[PDB]
Swiss-Prot record:
First-to-last residue of the parent protein present: 1 to 154 of 381
Similarity remark: Belongs to the protein-tyrosine phosphatase family. Non-receptor class dual specificity subfamily.
Tissue distribution: Expressed in keratinocytes (at protein level).
Reported disease: Hypogonadotropic hypogonadism 19 with or without anosmia: A disorder characterized by absent or incomplete sexual maturation by the age of 18 years, in conjunction with low levels of circulating gonadotropins and testosterone and no other abnormalities of the hypothalamic-pituitary axis. In some cases, it is associated with non-reproductive phenotypes, such as anosmia, cleft palate, and sensorineural hearing loss. Anosmia or hyposmia is related to the absence or hypoplasia of the olfactory bulbs and tracts.
Transmembrane segments: none
Lineage top rank: taxon: Eukaryota
Localisation: Cytoplasm
Residues in Rhodanese domain copies: 30-148
Protein name (record): Dual specificity protein phosphatase 6
Oligomer and partners: Interacts with MAPK1/ERK2.
Role: Dual specificity protein phosphatase, which mediates dephosphorylation and inactivation of MAP kinases. Has a specificity for the ERK family. Plays an important role in alleviating chronic postoperative pain. Necessary for the normal dephosphorylation of the long-lasting phosphorylated forms of spinal MAPK1/3 and MAP kinase p38 induced by peripheral surgery, which drives the resolution of acute postoperative allodynia. Also important for dephosphorylation of MAPK1/3 in local wound tissue, which further contributes to resolution of acute pain.
Organism: Homo sapiens
């Protein structure tokens, strides 16, 4: 495993919004070793797609497929329920969202205001906080255009 993604290769290339990785270890864990943020309806199944997904508030689950990079700013966060499940299961190990490239953060990687404060707060409490996106064959190789199991499947 990696302590807050310290290495260089995979499981250590997630800054603000690159992708989702953490060896089969984490990908298998999905209990009390991490805290994702995606979907809402089938929070159970969709969570299965990853470790422990959170009930995020999006329009149609980000088009029910992490493949678009467009969803409105703070599309899934500044609402209520989102922070509810998170703050509830916060402090597990690592927090990761699936807003994708250019969506909830608009693709800034610098320190915007909306998501800029949302992330800053998520890390302030004591976390790395990183979302998905689709950069290079690496980040996309991990969670390319998809990131789903009971929403899109194959």
């Amino acid at each position: 495993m990696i302590d807050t993604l310290r290495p260089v290769p995979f499981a250590s290339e997630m800054a603000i919004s690159k992708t989702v990785a953490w060896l089969n270890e984490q990908l298998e864990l999905g209990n009390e070793r991490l805290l994702l943020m995606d979907c809402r309806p089938q929070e159970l199944y969709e969570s299965s797609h990853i470790e422990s997904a959170i009930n995020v508030a999006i329009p149609g689950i980000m088009l029910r497929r992490l493949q678009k990079g467009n969803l409105p700013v703070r599309a899934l966060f500044t609402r209520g329920e989102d922070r509810d499940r998170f703050t509830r299961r916060c402090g597990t190990d690592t927090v990761v969202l699936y807003d994708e490239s250019s969506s909830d953060w608009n693709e800034n990687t610098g320190g915007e205001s909306l998501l800029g404060l949302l992330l800053k707060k998520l890390k302030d409490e004591g976390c790395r906080a990183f979302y998905l996106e689709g950069g290079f064959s690496k980040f996309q190789a991990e969670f390319s255009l998809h990131c789903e199991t009971n929403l899109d499947g194959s």
